[PDB]
Design an enzyme around this catalytic site. Structure first.
Site, PDB file in Angstrom:
ATOM      1  N   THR A 248       4.849   1.747 -16.312  1.00 33.75           N
ATOM      2  CA  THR A 248       6.011   0.958 -15.710  1.00 33.75           C
ATOM      3  C   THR A 248       6.745   0.149 -16.816  1.00 33.75           C
ATOM      4  OG1 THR A 248       4.566  -0.658 -14.766  1.00 33.75           O
ATOM      5  CG2 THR A 248       5.224   1.346 -13.395  1.00 33.75           C
ATOM      6  N   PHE A 373       7.953  -5.381  -7.981  1.00 36.15           N
ATOM      7  CA  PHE A 373       6.342  -5.435  -7.985  1.00 36.15           C
ATOM      8  C   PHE A 373       5.665  -5.381  -6.586  1.00 36.15           C
ATOM      9  CE2 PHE A 373       8.359  -7.599 -11.812  1.00 36.15           C
ATOM     10  CZ  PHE A 373       7.517  -6.886 -12.800  1.00 36.15           C
ATOM     11  N   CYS A 380       2.016  -6.329  -7.389  1.00 36.11           N
ATOM     12  CA  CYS A 380       1.561  -6.274  -8.752  1.00 36.11           C
ATOM     13  C   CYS A 380       0.702  -7.374  -9.170  1.00 36.11           C
ATOM     14  CB  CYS A 380       2.738  -5.817  -9.641  1.00 36.11           C
ATOM     15  SG  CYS A 380       2.207  -5.363 -11.168  1.00 36.11           S
TER      16      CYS A 380
HETATM   17  C1  HEM Z   1       7.370  -3.664 -14.828  1.00 38.56           C
HETATM   18  C2  HEM Z   1       6.227  -3.128 -14.823  1.00 38.56           C
HETATM   19  C3  HEM Z   1       5.516  -3.172 -13.557  1.00 38.56           C
HETATM   20  C4  HEM Z   1       5.671  -2.664 -12.165  1.00 38.56           C
HETATM   21  C5  HEM Z   1       7.356  -2.498 -11.848  1.00 38.56           C
HETATM   22  C6  HEM Z   1       4.607  -2.583 -11.502  1.00 38.56           C
HETATM   23  C7  HEM Z   1       4.697  -2.264 -10.267  1.00 38.56           C
HETATM   24  C8  HEM Z   1       3.874  -2.360  -9.076  1.00 38.56           C
HETATM   25  C9  HEM Z   1       3.932  -2.016  -7.700  1.00 38.56           C
HETATM   26  C10 HEM Z   1       5.155  -1.864  -6.881  1.00 38.56           C
HETATM   27  C11 HEM Z   1       2.822  -2.142  -7.240  1.00 38.56           C
HETATM   28  C12 HEM Z   1       2.467  -2.120  -5.760  1.00 38.56           C
HETATM   29  C13 HEM Z   1       1.814  -0.667  -5.549  1.00 38.56           C
HETATM   30  C14 HEM Z   1       1.838  -0.186  -4.003  1.00 38.56           C
HETATM   31  O1  HEM Z   1       2.163  -1.056  -3.221  1.00 38.56           O
HETATM   32  O2  HEM Z   1       1.510   0.780  -3.640  1.00 38.56           O
HETATM   33  C15 HEM Z   1       1.708  -2.711  -8.303  1.00 38.56           C
HETATM   34  C16 HEM Z   1       0.572  -2.924  -8.204  1.00 38.56           C
HETATM   35  C17 HEM Z   1      -0.384  -2.910  -9.035  1.00 38.56           C
HETATM   36  N1  HEM Z   1      -0.145  -3.059 -10.568  1.00 38.56           N
HETATM   37 FE1  HEM Z   1       1.858  -2.970 -11.200  1.00 38.56          FE
HETATM   38  N2  HEM Z   1       3.619  -2.659 -12.061  1.00 38.56           N
HETATM   39  C18 HEM Z   1       3.929  -3.176 -13.452  1.00 38.56           C
HETATM   40  C19 HEM Z   1       3.211  -3.617 -14.212  1.00 38.56           C
HETATM   41  C20 HEM Z   1       1.801  -3.588 -14.150  1.00 38.56           C
HETATM   42  C21 HEM Z   1       0.826  -4.117 -15.094  1.00 38.56           C
HETATM   43  C22 HEM Z   1       1.319  -4.510 -16.737  1.00 38.56           C
HETATM   44  C23 HEM Z   1      -0.334  -4.205 -14.864  1.00 38.56           C
HETATM   45  C24 HEM Z   1      -1.624  -4.411 -15.453  1.00 38.56           C
HETATM   46  C25 HEM Z   1      -1.606  -5.365 -16.561  1.00 38.56           C
HETATM   47  C26 HEM Z   1      -0.297  -3.571 -13.292  1.00 38.56           C
HETATM   48  C27 HEM Z   1      -1.225  -3.403 -12.718  1.00 38.56           C
HETATM   49  C28 HEM Z   1      -1.384  -3.122 -11.176  1.00 38.56           C
HETATM   50  C29 HEM Z   1      -2.363  -3.150 -10.423  1.00 38.56           C
HETATM   51  C30 HEM Z   1      -3.794  -3.510 -10.856  1.00 38.56           C
HETATM   52  C31 HEM Z   1      -1.806  -3.213  -8.878  1.00 38.56           C
HETATM   53  C32 HEM Z   1      -2.576  -3.123  -7.973  1.00 38.56           C
HETATM   54  C33 HEM Z   1      -2.663  -4.503  -7.199  1.00 38.56           C
HETATM   55  C34 HEM Z   1      -3.772  -4.575  -5.914  1.00 38.56           C
HETATM   56  O3  HEM Z   1      -3.283  -3.540  -4.984  1.00 38.56           O
HETATM   57  O4  HEM Z   1      -4.602  -5.365  -5.851  1.00 38.56           O
HETATM   58  N3  HEM Z   1       1.010  -3.384 -13.347  1.00 38.56           N
HETATM   59  N4  HEM Z   1       2.550  -2.615  -9.217  1.00 38.56           N
HETATM   60  C1  LIG Z   2       2.518   0.008 -12.982  1.00 40.67           C
HETATM   61  C2  LIG Z   2       1.582  -0.588 -11.622  1.00 40.67           C
HETATM   62  C3  LIG Z   2       1.528   0.387 -11.030  1.00 40.67           C
HETATM   63  C4  LIG Z   2       0.660   0.426  -9.830  1.00 40.67           C
HETATM   64  C5  LIG Z   2       0.699   1.529  -8.984  1.00 40.67           C
HETATM   65  C6  LIG Z   2       1.481   2.441  -8.881  1.00 40.67           C
HETATM   66  C7  LIG Z   2       2.583   2.311 -10.014  1.00 40.67           C
HETATM   67  C8  LIG Z   2       2.415   1.217 -10.657  1.00 40.67           C
END
Ligand code: HEM
Ligand SMILES: C=Cc1ccccc1
EC number: 1.14.14.1
Length: 435
Positions: A248, A373, A380
């Site tokens: 992402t 996010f 996120c």
């Molecule tokens: C611009 C970049 C990014 C975007 C737009 C993004 C977006 C998102 C979104 C929308 C979710 C929620 C997913 C859901 O509700 O099903 C999420 C969760 C998550 N992301 Fe990101 N992400 C980004 C970058 C990253 C990075 C750099 C990492 C790790 C270093 C990461 C790790 C995670 C993890 C582990 C979750 C799950 C958190 C949880 O539910 O406890 N993401 N992200």
């Molecule tokens: C890149 C963080 C993230 C976590 C779940 C779905 C798509 C993106």
């Protein structure tokens, strides 16, 4: 009130609408036609697609709705298990890993990642400094080289060495083939397992005090349960963060650059900031934090093309959504983020313009209007990591090079788990400023 529903296909209901390589973009057009909410049915299932801030603000109420695993995340769970992104909130390993890993994204941790983010950013700048006259850049390809290397190095002290390669890494290839072929697979799962094995084995062998994300996975204890992660879940978390940690972010960098080259006045304003702030050969942490307009560019690219474009929720109890739509316990909702981000009642009529200045006064933005996010405790965990990396890198790109949209590139958004501008290419003329 009865919900609109797009066209149906006999006993297949709405399912054939998803039979396209661009389903999110197809769902955005349906939203344009039907409005803030529509019913989507397939054999054996229903979901409700939400597009207005008025309704999404309620969906984001954690007393009423919790994270659901989409079809996509269910498939990803075959490889990422109960790692953070693919666990249910009620699974013991969700809260345990959440608590253990949150400190890996504190301000102190971010400052700790900075030098290794610079190492990779410098490799990207050197690559482009070293191109011959008239050569061009394959933007998402290079951004993926940078973001995969950055999470490897910062998170795990592992060098994917993507800038030493012509074709992507065998880990990446295996991760795509292998999941692909779940909706040779033997040798692929082995590539994934071997890499996880190695990341673990090498940290354990090293005589190395480290405070990185891997260090917290291996040694941190959950203050609630007092337990550390078990070995099976650590493996899942490594897989989870290697993927979530880069795809992402590469999308965001690619869209940001695409919007800058399409909006030269915005590019010039962002370049002027980069030149004013980044006064040293190497950016410092403090200087990246002063790239305010570059941060706004990034936010405005996440507004138009949020790179994880949808998330799913279920109703914790029977409830009424928006005073008009009764829901039963278990009912699913899907938040269509690109559509939320185009809600005219929030953003004004010019929603398709790229205008980073929309983010000058972010306290003016109503609750839950901007959600790239995700939401709440299931938001996120890596948001600050993604934004710090993308700010550093775009600031360096804008300090070191002028850019040309030499093909007059026609936006073509390829959909995987993430979104990217497929085939986006540019030329970068060096400003000849040393590193
Ligand atoms: C611009 C970049 C990014 C975007 C737009 C993004 C977006 C998102 C979104 C929308 C979710 C929620 C997913 C859901 O509700 O099903 C999420 C969760 C998550 N992301 Fe990101 N992400 C980004 C970058 C990253 C990075 C750099 C990492 C790790 C270093 C990461 C790790 C995670 C993890 C582990 C979750 C799950 C958190 C949880 O539910 O406890 N993401 N992200
Ligand atoms: C890149 C963080 C993230 C976590 C779940 C779905 C798509 C993106």
């Amino acid at each position: 009130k009865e919900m609109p529903q797009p066209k149906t296909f006999g006993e297949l209901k709405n399912l054939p609408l998803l039979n396209t390589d661009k389903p999110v973009q197809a769902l955005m057009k349906i939203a344009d036609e039907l409005g803030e909410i529509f019913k989507f049915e397939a054999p054996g299932r229903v979901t409700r697609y939400l597009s207005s801030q008025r309704l999404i603000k309620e969906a984001c109420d954690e007393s009423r709705f919790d994270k659901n695993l989409s079809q996509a995340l269910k498939f990803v769970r075959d490889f990422a298990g109960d790692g953070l992104a693919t666990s249910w909130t009620h699974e013991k390993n969700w809260k345990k890993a959440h608590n253990i890993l949150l400190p890996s994204f504190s301000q102190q941790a971010m400052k700790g990642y900075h030098a290794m983010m610079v190492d990779i950013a410098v490799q990207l700048v050197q690559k482009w400094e070293r191109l011959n006259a008239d050569e061009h850049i394959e933007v998402p390809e290079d951004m993926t080289r940078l973001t995969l290397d950055t999470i490897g190095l910062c998170g795990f002290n592992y060098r994917f060495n993507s800038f030493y390669r012509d074709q992507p890494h065998p880990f990446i290839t295996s991760m795509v083939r292998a999941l692909d072929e779940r909706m040779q697979f033997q040798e692929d799962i082995k590539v994934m397992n071997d890499l996880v094995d190695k990341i673990i084995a090498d940290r354990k062998a090293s005589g190395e005090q480290s405070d990185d994300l891997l260090a917290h996975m291996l040694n941190g204890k959950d203050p609630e349960t007092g337990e550390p992660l078990d070995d099976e879940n650590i493996r899942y978390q490594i897989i989870t963060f290697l993927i979530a940690g880069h795809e992402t972010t590469s999308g965001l960098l690619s869209f940001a650059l695409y919007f800058l080259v399409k909006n030269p006045h915005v590019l010039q304003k962002a370049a002027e900031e980069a030149a004013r702030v980044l006064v040293d050969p190497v950016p410092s942490y403090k200087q990246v934090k002063q790239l305010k307009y570059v941060g706004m560019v990034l936010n405005e690219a996440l507004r138009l093309w949020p790179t994880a474009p949808a998330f799913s929720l279920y109703a914790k109890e029977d409830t009424v959504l928006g005073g008009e739509y009764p829901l039963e316990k278990g009912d699913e909702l899907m938040v269509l983020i690109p559509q939320l981000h185009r809600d005219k009642t929030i953003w004004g009529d010019d929603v398709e313009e790229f205008r980073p200045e929309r983010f000058e006064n972010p306290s003016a933005i109503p609750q839950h209007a901007f959600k790239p996010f995700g939401n709440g405790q299931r938001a996120c965990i890596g948001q600050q990591f993604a934004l710090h990396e993308a700010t550093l890198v775009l600031g360096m790109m804008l300090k070191h090079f002028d850019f040309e949209d030499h093909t007059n590139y026609e936006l073509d958004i390829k959909e995987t788990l993430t979104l990217k501008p497929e085939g986006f290419v540019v030329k970068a003329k060096s400003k000849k400023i040393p590193l």
